[PDB]
Design a protein around this nucleic acid. Structure first.
Length: 106
RNA sequence: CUGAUAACUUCACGGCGGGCUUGAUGUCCGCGUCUACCUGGUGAACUGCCGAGUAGGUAG
């Protein structure tokens, strides 16, 4: 994966006046990254999650092969999923967690 | 077969000094609660005797 600096420009110069939807992520050698990380030097506005997470009630109820895995706890997974978003990790990492699990049973 | 593989942010700290919320006040007038009601122990634990005895005892 690489980072398109048209999407880095587009998300920056449209999110510079709303603060409920933007999280600032800094870097320390702005000159080596190129002029895009020098003009807005350091800042990098990128699409915060939107609100604090809310936990409603789960369900309101009364072949096959369905396996469960209850309450996995993760300590310190990264949130910078795309180069432009911040929040829940990329769901291709939830895919790799499954496919590295099905190769262990095989 | 996971923006893959590995990863110590740390050390130090005095928020302080002073202070008048006050003055005045009419909640009032009127008022019909009422009519009717089954709780059901059959005979069933009976009769003496001592003691002055509404105490006490004692018989089959």
């Amino acid at each position: 994966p690489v980072a398109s600096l048209s999407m880095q420009s587009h998300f920056h110069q449209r999110l510079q006046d709303e603060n409920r939807h933007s999280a600032i992520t800094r870097f320390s050698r702005t000159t080596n990254m190129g002029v895009t990380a020098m003009t807005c030097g350091g800042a990098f506005r990128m699409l915060k999650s939107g609100a604090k997470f809310s936990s409603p009630p789960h369900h309101r109820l009364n072949n096959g092969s369905f396996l469960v895995l209850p309450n996995i706890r993760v300590c310190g997974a990264t949130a910078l999923s795309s180069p432009v978003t911040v929040g829940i990790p990329s769901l291709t990492a939830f895919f790799g967690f499954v496919h590295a699990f099905e190769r262990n049973i095989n």
